[PDB]
Amino acid sequence: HSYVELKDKVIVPGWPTLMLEIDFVGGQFLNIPFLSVKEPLQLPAEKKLTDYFTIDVEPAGHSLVNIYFQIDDFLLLTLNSLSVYKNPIRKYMFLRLNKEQSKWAINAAFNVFSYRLRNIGVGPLGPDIRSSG
Length: 133
Description:
By secondary structure, the protein is of the alpha+beta class. It has a single domain (1-133), classed as Topoisomerase I, domain 3 (Distorted Sandwich). It has four helices and seven strands. It has helices at residues 49-52, 73-82, 99-107, 126-131; strands at residues 4-5, 17-24, 30-36, 53-59, 65-71, 92-96, 112-120. The strands form two sheets. The chain has a four-stranded mixed sheet. Strand 2 and strand 3 (30-36) form a beta hairpin. The protein is globular, with a radius of gyration of 15 Å. Keywords: Host cell membrane, Host cytoplasm, Host membrane, Membrane, Viral matrix protein, Virion. Homooligomer. Homotetramer. Interacts with phosphoprotein P. Binds to ssRNA. It is a peripheral membrane protein. This is Matrix protein.
């Protein structure tokens, strides 16, 4: 198995968005627009995200970081349905923090305290923006 990149393409303008928010050890989080989606992500309130979703922050170089994750079939299937872009979620994927975002993870010793996915709705032109172009 490999870790495929979840590329920027998956964040389509106009549509709602799932924000990955990461709380490092220290206390002001780190916010990454994870995936644009047609409908909000609600999990069975029985369960929590950690059950289905595991992330690891590693350095990619002297100055950059990536976030790796492993997604269990349920969430995988759940995200793929919700996605605006055509079913882009594999079991093993990674995404690339930028030079800006990286600094934080480096300074935090890569040590994640907690994380969540969070639904962010659309803005005032959204409807018009998503249908245009």
